[PDB]
Amino acid sequence: IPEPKPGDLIEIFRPFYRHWAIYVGDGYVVHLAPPAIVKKELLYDVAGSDKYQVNNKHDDKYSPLPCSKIIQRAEELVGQEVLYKLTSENCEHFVNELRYGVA
């Protein structure tokens, strides 16, 4: 897999779970983690042995926001709590809000 662009959605294929993250560069992604807390961590470390892919699933319906706006919002949330639990669907929702906005 070539290096993703900043703002790209990353789908991580666990056994029995789909963890999502958004690429913010230099090997880093922003994603949710159990204490949910927003973390900025290296994709190699997050994925471990699991496969992953870029999956900008909704680029056919919505334009991504400007890359600098995606990154600013992702960075503003790093270290902050979110009010829902980790599920595959909640994780995907989280990164979709970053790439596409609240709509």
Whole-Å CA distances, 38 to 1, 62, 82, 85: 25, 24, 7, 12
Experiment used for this model: X-ray
Name the catalytic one among 19, 58, 67, 93: 19
Tell me which long-range contacts 68-74 makes (C-beta under 8 A, separation of at least 24): 70/6, 70/7, 70/22, 70/98, 70/99, 71/6, 71/7, 71/24, 71/25, 73/98, 74/22, 74/24, 74/30, 74/40, 74/98
Beta partners for residue 12, in sequence order: 19, 52
How many Å apart are CA 13 and CA 61, to the nearest integer?
24
Catalytic residue among 31, 58, 67, 93: 31
Quick check: is 58 catalytic? Answer: no
Based on the residue annotation, tell me whether 19 is a catalytic residue of this protein. Answer: yes
Whether 12 contacts 18, CB under 8 Å: yes
Order of all β-strands in the sheet with 17-25? 37-42, 28-33, 17-25, 9-14, 51-54
81: tokens are 């709590």
Active site residue 91: yes
